[model samples]
Target chain A: SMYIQQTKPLTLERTINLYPLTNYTFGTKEPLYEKDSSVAARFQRMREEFDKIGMRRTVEGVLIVHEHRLPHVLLLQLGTTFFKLPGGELNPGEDEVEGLKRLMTEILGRQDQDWVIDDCIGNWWRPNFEPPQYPYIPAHITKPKEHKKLFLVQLQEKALFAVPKNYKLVAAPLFELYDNAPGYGPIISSLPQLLSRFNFIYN
Target chain B: KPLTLERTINLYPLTNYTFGTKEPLYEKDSSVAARFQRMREEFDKIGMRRTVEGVLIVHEHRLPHVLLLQLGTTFFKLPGGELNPGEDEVEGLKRLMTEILGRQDDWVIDDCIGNWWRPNFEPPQYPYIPAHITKPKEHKKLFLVQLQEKALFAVPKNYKLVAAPLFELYDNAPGYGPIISSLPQLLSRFNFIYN
Candidate 1:
């Protein structure tokens, strides 16, 4: 089946600039601490926070760099299996972009890290307290437990990031993440498609 | 501040689209094996297959949803097909759209979303050409088919048309397949307005 429609006035387009992977440097920094010490403690804290704040606002950044004529995402890996973007939960009443900038700084910023957060990639919603998150809220569910936003964090020509000592930061190719849900999780795995819309310049 | 480049796309709300059921449409081939068999024959005669798919989007609950065609329970696809020999990509897509959907509505096809290359005649298609493979068997181009303010769609009786939200396709390769599933990311760059 198919359809058609007229264009809306005041339509706006978005663009993001990307730099080469060589433009950025990485070094080890002091270990960072999590809000909760363990998994049980983590969810317990989330439950309490939800009780107080209604829903949790989480944001993660997609930092892109070009290598071998393809774009790669900067991801933080903990242990062998766990990988995540450079972000964390936002505080109550915190602005989405500002909070993401703060979280990016907390996780990967060094003396020279400059995060220019602008473009928002997409948003996901958690229906319940558990781990399942979707790009849109299900029709039946009225209240969502969490709202996570993904942003495209623009990087300057060159900068240094002091990654936490406990975590290893790696640049993952789009192909590596494509159709790899089990390896990168749904949000991370589908990044290949999410990011395909961009016209990247290898500068 | 650093110098940056800009790209633009327009979006509409899901509520604007109207759907109606039409006569059942059938595929050229009866089975998967027959589909590939015709592909092999067409490849030898036409060199490589030039396929195009249109991405029709509408917004719902502040998120973008793609217009996808569902067959049976598991298979989903965009409304498109192979181009005739020496046919232009955009024009070919328009023809395929009219063939698959209907000829009543006017199509505005211009913006190219992305491209995929099928290294072999088999099912796998990659967003980029694989480094090891020099010659691809098929080249599929995806274009953003912009809709008017209000429009009506006549869906085929055998196929169900769904306005799948970006989240439903996001990371959902198993349900929507790789190309359809990745639309969320492929479309993320656009600045969409809910109206």
Candidate 2:
């Protein structure tokens, strides 16, 4: 009976403890964009467009890895303090998957990008009236007025990302989500609860 | 100078006068009671079920008057209910409007301004549910409908009907808080659509 034998492990040791509720406080901590000619003009145009629309649905392209047999995800940094997952709004009635693929392709280009989509992890939301606090990043202020849908997209291959001049991307460890308190934006603020919603870990 | 039109709606007297309330409108009538129960069953069948309906039976005047349902002297409501199972949202809304306004097949649904979502959250516990359970989302889709034939404004036998002034309707109503809160936004959106 020299057939290949396979066994799946039933349990995993917990590595990180999620931060308790007493750790968080409300309001946004998003850093502002530099008001240079290009950035200022861009931000102003974005403000004008946001004034016209009502609801906006965005996708979060989460690249999670089970390496070390524990999971982690990629987070995008804009300006000095703001950080969020990758993905953006598709025009109304646009296929969300196609939108996400277009974004991933744009980010990775025609290279052998280690980006493969798994299942959608979960959806998170923010209400219509919620607004970001001052010295605001344009994206931060605009999102609060819209109905936000945060989809946790699993990545099949570990993605390698290039840091553009204005932004940075990094893999955030899941356990330390609440360590710094409300240092990160809504994604970080709601990370622990989001993990539980997906039942991703034991802790 | 523009003329200001005023409308008065009948309101139900509160059982406890010191703190306001109204008679349980649906509970008293056997048919309405059964229909409400059936609606509740459909809610259970569709996890995080959504509802779509229309309201504000308006009288076409310089300033439109909205129709409100009165119980005793304390409470008011808009006559629209949840869509039944396997029902198209527009069709269901048409049915609800017919049941309440009694001018079936004549009213024209003019436009849909926006949708209102009421999220259900779990109580503080060991683990938190950030997203709705299995994406069980609840939505109220609203439309502006017009009565082609003058609606015969008849309050259900047990209740009273009032043509309420638009100002009297904003963000009020104890038992029917959502319906009340929704009206101000709905009217504001209608203004946006028209302007």
Candidate 3:
């Protein structure tokens, strides 16, 4: 063939974010993301400072779907003094089998709304034979035309970073607690078929 | 109203889709069916709702990738196309811009062209006025044009009008494209250089 390449690192968020997205609709209470700051506007300002603390009904959100190959290394162990923040989600406009009920509502939340978006694959796709180099630029880029029926989702909240003051828990030691159920973990039941079952090819 | 125009006037095959099947990997390319067959041959050689009449153009910009025809200073109202059958749709928009501006009809140049609109989008289709055509009927009103005199150039080797592209990307998406002001959609969208 074209010298056999099949690479796989394409990612359509490799479809994860498991659990809570059942047709997930809820918009225009304002803030579908705006910025003078960003990481999705520092977590919608921590979901508006926990909707002004009624304990903001215990914060949680998720939609993470990283892919494989291009792997530098940094899977996880939560290693934060060992297991904390424990929150979750990823269902709604779901396109892949639900993921572990979107991580059982991030380790159990919102009364675990029936949970079940875990379209399982939870793991696989490992390639990274060594490749890392960068520098390429030629810009003219023009774009701006969104609103095909409004989709402004981004709710993967979490807790602990000192319980929260706009969180900062950026510790790292291979993910931590090595799960015993460290808040319903197993990399959220194996990141939706890791690297979308890989098949990029072109050598 | 010999305006028949029901639909499929010509130009099909933009997305036969399903090489990737509905929603997977997302594919569908023939680039909008060869940019709608050179934008329906430049609207079949300029004549979409009354080509042009009475003019004074000169607005220029040279060219690199080339494709333009913007003289935007503005002013037009023209509709003077009368003759017969539901009253000659403005003489079939004045005998199709006198056969694509070869010029005549007393060489236009009268009111020269000012303010014109029938569907240039002014709520003309959003909450009303399109229950299958109402108000600006007759083949559905909508116009505002220019050109009648001066150095006289006609472009259309692939129509060019520019300006409009602030940012966009992310539709059905794995790769999506479409955003152009005009120059006849770059000589017919997707082929760039007139398809």
Candidate 4:
């Protein structure tokens, strides 16, 4: 059988930044996705695994402001009209952190080595079957349930994108994100929840 | 007001629960029983701290399957044994596999799926470790083994055997077959390989 040993839940008590959320969306409005044969094939392998299995495990990231002085987070454009967090699945037996680190290097330049990790935030799960009320359940090749572990990635040295063709890296300002209006909407919706559960910043 | 968010999981669905009664078929004083007891005592030396299970995921001509160890006709378990003291994990695991299943010469340990943590359980009469550290946690590592042996079956030394399809084992073994209890969830971690 199964057993659960739970402790009294902890609470976060601070409420800084009373100044309301800002109004700035990050990145270009025109979205883009890689359609090259190899790109499609790479994703095709992962899609087959998803189709065969019920749950699809992935890594998602939230990189906070570094030098930009403004509130910003990193997002990737994978479709002709949508934004996603940067991360992917691991190679067989690969360590989780190493796999995610490799993914960042692939999407960003090698300078990604300069990227500092704040901490693994926590795990979030989404079932394959869609709920009736939500407006934006993005279509996946397979209805594999998504198991995403979000990590906070930080970069001190000025970071820039050298992503492969079709992928665009954008550092969208924090205020530009809201639950109902759009790009990476689910992430924007859950941002506050994550911040409350874990410490937000690290030196 | 800031939003209120919480997270919880129903781990029941992820567990491989043992179905059969705890009454094992063999006599409590047999040589094999003594061996198992002495080994378990070795575990108690460290409070039953950690374990490594050798899973032979055989992808033979048909569906992929794993080996099952049946003690007499009623008691069933996997071919793996307990963890060793003062030894590297994977190396110890290799010795355990050879000890139980004999050498295949062509077998390969592909990769480790990861660790599963088991919390201690209590009823009333417990005598494994000191009551203080009785809350023993088992860290189980599932090793994905690939082999090409065309013919294989049970071995001697108080053990019988069977082959279960990787997918079928989900419903077959009571709590996913012996030693470690979370076999089902651990298997799911390698859904890509097993599926």
Best by DockQ: 1
Across B78-175, the per-residue lDDT of candidate 3 in tens digits comes to: 22232234343334444544443332212322111111223322212111122223333212221112332332322222222332211111111122
Deviating ranges (above 4 Å) for candidate 1: A1-20, B1-50, B57-67, B70-75, B83-95, B108-115, B127-131, B143-150, B154-176, B181-195
* Candidate 1 chain B weakest ten by summed lDDT: B1-10
Segments of candidate 4 deviating more than 4 angstroms: A1-203, B1-49, B60-62, B72-75, B103-107, B118-138, B149-154, B171-195
TM-score, every prediction: 0.75, 0.36, 0.19, 0.38
- Residue by residue across A108-153, what tens digits does model 2's lDDT show? 3333343344333334333333343211112223455343334445
lDDT of 4 by residue, A76-182 (tens): 66645567777776665676667787777656654324555444544544444332111112233334356666666755534445655565666655445522335
Please give the ranking of all candidate structures by TM-score, highest first, separated by commas.
Answer: 1, 4, 2, 3
Q: Judged by TM-score, which candidate is best?
A: 1
RMSD of each predicted structure: 6.5, 16.1, 23.8, 16.8
lDDT of 1 by residue, B103-126 (tens): 344898755667787888799998
| TM-score on 0 to 1 scale for chain A of candidate 3 | 0.20
DockQ-better candidate, 1 vs 3? 1
Q: Candidate 2 vs candidate 3: which has greater TM-score? A: 2
lDDT by candidate, in order shown: 0.78, 0.45, 0.24, 0.46
What DockQ was computed for model 3? 0.01
Candidate 2 scores a C-alpha RMSD against the true structure in Å of 16.1
Measured with C-alpha atoms, the lDDT of residue B117 in candidate 2 is 41
- Please state the error at residue A142 of candidate 2 in Å: 34
